[PDB]
Amino acid sequence: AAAQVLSSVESEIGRTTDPVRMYMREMGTVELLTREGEIDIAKRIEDGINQVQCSVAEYPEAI
DNA sequence: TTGGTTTTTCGTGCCATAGGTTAATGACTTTACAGAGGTTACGTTTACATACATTTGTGAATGTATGTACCATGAACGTACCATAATAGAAAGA
Secondary structure, eight states: OOHHHHHHHHHHOOOOOOHHHHHHHHTTSSOOOOSTTHHHHHHHHHHHHHHHHHHHHTOGGGO
């Protein structure tokens, strides 16, 4: 959703081999998250860890 | 009157009687080689006490080992002198 700006950037770039500008042009796609926006990410982490632990608990020979 | 055959002495040559230095094998005798017999001072073999090493446990040096819970949201963070010409490349008008 941000490659249209990166194409116009790379049209100006004369094959820069320095990884610093390359790194801080690939990392600039995702913007800043909000303060309470990562709470839902943490809850999805909770749901994933709980699903893995339920999959372990349904295995009978783990005990 | 002169040359040459004949003849006799005489010192010289040949033969025989005497008598002495010195070769012979030996018998020497002296030196050298061959025979055993008592004595010396080592050279190899053996046992025994003590020593440096080398083999063990035990008290200290470091070293990775995982974490610390007000708030920390994009940049190079100071690099650098700018020579010269063979050979290609990506486009721009011929």
